[PDB]
Amino acid sequence: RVRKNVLHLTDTEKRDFVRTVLILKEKGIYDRYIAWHGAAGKFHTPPGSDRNAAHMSSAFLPWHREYLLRFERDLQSINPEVTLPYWEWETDAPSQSQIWSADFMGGNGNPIKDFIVDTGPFAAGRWTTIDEQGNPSGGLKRNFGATKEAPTLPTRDDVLNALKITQYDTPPWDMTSQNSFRNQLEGFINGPQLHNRVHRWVGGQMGVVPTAPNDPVFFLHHANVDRIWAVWQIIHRNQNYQPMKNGPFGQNFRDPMYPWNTTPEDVMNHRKLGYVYDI
Amino acid sequence: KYRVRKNVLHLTDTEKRDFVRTVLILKEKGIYDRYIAWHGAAGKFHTPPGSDRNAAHMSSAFLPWHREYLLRFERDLQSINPEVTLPYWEWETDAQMQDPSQSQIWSADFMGGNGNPIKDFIVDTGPFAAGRWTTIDEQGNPSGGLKRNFGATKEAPTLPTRDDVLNALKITQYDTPPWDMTSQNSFRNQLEGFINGPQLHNRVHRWVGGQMGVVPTAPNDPVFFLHHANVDRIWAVWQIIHRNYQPMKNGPFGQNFRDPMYPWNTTPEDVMNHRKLGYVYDIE
Numbered sequence: 378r379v380r381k382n383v384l385h386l387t388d389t390e391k392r393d394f395v396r397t398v399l400i401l402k403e404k405g406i407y408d409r410y411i412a413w414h415g416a417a418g419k420f421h422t423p424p425g426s427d428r429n430a431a432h433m434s435s436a437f438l439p440w441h442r443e444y445l446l447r448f449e450r451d452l453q454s455i456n457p458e459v460t461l462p463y464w465e466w467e468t469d470a471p472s473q474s475q476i477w478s479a480d481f482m483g484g485n486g487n488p489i490k491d492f493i494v495d496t497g498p499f500a501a502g503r504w505t506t507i508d509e510q511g512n513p514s515g516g517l518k519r520n521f522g523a524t525k526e527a528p529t530l531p532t533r534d535d536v537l538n539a540l541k542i543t544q545y546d547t548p549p550w551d552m553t554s555q556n557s558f559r560n561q562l563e564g565f566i567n568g569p570q571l572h573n574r575v576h577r578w579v580g581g582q583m584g585v586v587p588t589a590p591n592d593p594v595f596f597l598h599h600a601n602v603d604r605i606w607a608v609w610q611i612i613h614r615n616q617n618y619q620p621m622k623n624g625p626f627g628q629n630f631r632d633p634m635y636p637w638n639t640t641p642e643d644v645m646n647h648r649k650l651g652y653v654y655d656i
Numbered sequence: 657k658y659r660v661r662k663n664v665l666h667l668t669d670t671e672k673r674d675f676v677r678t679v680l681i682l683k684e685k686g687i688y689d690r691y692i693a694w695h696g697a698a699g700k701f702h703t704p705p706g707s708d709r710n711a712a713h714m715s716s717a718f719l720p721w722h723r724e725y726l727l728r729f730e731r732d733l734q735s736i737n738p739e740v741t742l743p744y745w746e747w748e749t750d751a752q753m754q755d756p757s758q759s760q761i762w763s764a765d766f767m768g769g770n771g772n773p774i775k776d777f778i779v780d781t782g783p784f785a786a787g788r789w790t791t792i793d794e795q796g797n798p799s800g801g802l803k804r805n806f807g808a809t810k811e812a813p814t815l816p817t818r819d820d821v822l823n824a825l826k827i828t829q830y831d832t833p834p835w836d837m838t839s840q841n842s843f844r845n846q847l848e849g850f851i852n853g854p855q856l857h858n859r860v861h862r863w864v865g866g867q868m869g870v871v872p873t874a875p876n877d878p879v880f881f882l883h884h885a886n887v888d889r890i891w892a893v894w895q896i897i898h899r900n901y902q903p904m905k906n907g908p909f910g911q912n913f914r915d916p917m918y919p920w921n922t923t924p925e926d927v928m929n930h931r932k933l934g935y936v937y938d939i940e
C-alpha cells in the first residue's frame with residue numbers, strides 16, 4: 378500500500394516510522410502486541426505439543442500476517458502515510474547495514490552492559506521492556522552472530538530455493554514437515570535457516586520467541602517474511618493453504634488463531650487486506 | 657433477553673447432563689483451552705506494566721472482563737447447543753449447609769465432589785475426574801489432575817454468606833481511585849474480595865482450593881464458570897439497584913470505560929448491559 382524496501386526509504390520516512398512506533402509505545406498499544414505474541418507462544422496445539430498458535434505449525438505465516446496487519450493499521454491511526462517496511466536480510470546476508478544506524482534501529486548490544494543496546498531510538502532508558510512473564514526486563518538486548526548455529530544471515534539463494542517448494546505445508550503440520558514451504562521459511566528444515574536463523578543471528582530478545590517483539594526489528598523482519606510468502610503465493614497459484622482439515626485445532630484453514638478469532642482464510646490474500654510490496 | 661441462566665440447584669438431571677456434555681465438547685474440540693489461556697494471558701498483562709493491577713484483576717475491569725469472558729464462553733456453548741446456558745452456583749446458600757460439600761452441585765452427575773486426601777486431593781468423582789479431564793499450568797504447559805480441597809486453608813474456612821452478599825449490595829460506588837486493591841467503599845473491590853479479605857470472590861476460590869485456589873490456573877476447574885456466573889449474577893443484581901462504571905477517564909490505560917480489555921478490543925462499556933447481550937438470570 379505500499380510496503381517498501383527499508384533500504385529505499387527516505388530519511389523522513391525512516392524518522393516518521395520510528396516516531397510512530399514510539400507513539401504506539403507511549404499509548405500502551407505496543408505492549409498489547411508483545412503480550413499477544415507471548416500469549417500465542419504459550420498456546421500449544423494441542424497442549425503439550427511443540428506447536429503453538431503462532432509458530433512451529435501451519436498457522437505460522439497467517440498468524441504473523443494478521444499480526445502485522447493489525448500493527449500497520451495502528452501505525453496508520455497515528456500517521457496514515459506510514460507503512461510497515463521490510464528488511465531484505467537476504468541481500469544483507471552482515472551488520473554493515475544501514476538498518477542499524479543511530480537514526481533507525483540502533484546497533485548491536487553492549488557486551489560490557491550485558492548486551493543491552495545503548496544506541497539508537499530504542500536503547501535502554503529510552504525504551505522499556507517486558508520479560509516472558511510480562512514484568513519489566515531491563516532493556517533491549519542484541520548479540521549479532523554470537524551462536525555457532527547462526528553466525529550469518531540467510532542468503533538470496535536460500536530464499537529462492539525455498540520459493541521452489543511445491544506445497545504450502547505437509548503433515549504432520551509441525552517442525553518436521555517435509556517439502557513444506559512453511560517449514561522451510563520458518564526455518565526448521567536443517568535449522569536454523571531463514572526465519573529461525575535471522576532470529577538466532579540478531580540475539581537478545583529477538584533470540585527468544587516470547588520476547589522477540591520487544592525489538593522493533595521484529596516487524597521489519599516479519600514484513601520481509603510475509604513478503605517472501607506473498608511472493609510464493611504469486612508463484613504457486615495452483616496451491617492453497619494447508620491443512621484444510623485434520624490439523625490440530627488452530628492450524629486448519631477455518632480455525633480461529635488464538636489469541637484472535639481471525640483465521641488463516643481471512644488473511645490468505647494479502648492484497649485483499651489492502652497493501653502490496655514493491656512488486 | 658432470551659437466554660436464561662438458572663440456579664444450579666434448580667437444573668434437572670437432564671439439563672445438568674447437557675451442560676456437562678457441551679463443556680466436554682468445547683474441551684475436546686480445543687476451544688475450552690482458549691479460555692484458560694486468555695485468562696492467564698490477561699493476569700500477566702499489567703496496566704501499567706509493572707503495576708499490581710492486571711487487565712482482569714486487582715482493578716476496575718475485573719467484573720467487565722469476566723462478564724465478557726463468560727459471554728464468549730456461553731456463545732461457544734451455544735454454537736454446539738443453542739439451548740444450553742451458563743448456570744450459576746449460589747454459594748452463599750450452600751454456606752448455610754451444615755456441610756457444603758454435600759451440596760448437590762458436587763454430585764457425580766455435575767461438578768464432581770471434593771478431592772481425595774489420599775490421592776493428593778485430585779478429584780476422582782464426576783464428569784471431570786482425573787483421567788476424564790486434563791489440565792495445564794500457569795505457563796501453558798501440561799499439568800496433572802483436577803484437585804479440590806473444600807475449606808482447607810485457615811483463610812477461607814467457610815463459604816461467603818448471604819449477609820456478605822447483602823452487605824456488598826449496599827455499596828454505592830462501582831469503584832474508587834486509585835482503582836486498585838486499596839480502593840475503599842468500592843463495590844468492585846468489595847466483590848473481588850482481596851481487601852478486607854478473603855471474602856466473596858477471592859474467598860470462594862480459596863475455599864475450593866486446588867486449581868481454583870490460584871487465579872491463573874483456576875479456569876482449569878469447570879466450577880470456575882459456575883462461580884463467576886454467580887459473580888456476574890451478583891453484579892447484575894447490583895446493577896439492578898444501582899444499575900455503571902469508573903474509571904470513566906484518567907485511569908490506567910485498559911481500565912477506563914472506553915479502553916480495550918486485553919486480550920480483546922472489547923471495552924467495559926460494551927458489557928455494561930447484560931440483558932442486551934442476550935441473557936438474564938433465572939431470578940430476573
Ligand SMILES: [Cu+2]
Binds near residue numbers: 431441586589
Ligand atoms: Cu513470532
Ligand SMILES: [Cu+2]
Binds near residue numbers: 576589599
Ligand atoms: Cu519471529
Ligand SMILES: [Cu+2]
Binds near residue numbers: 695
Ligand atoms: Cu479471574
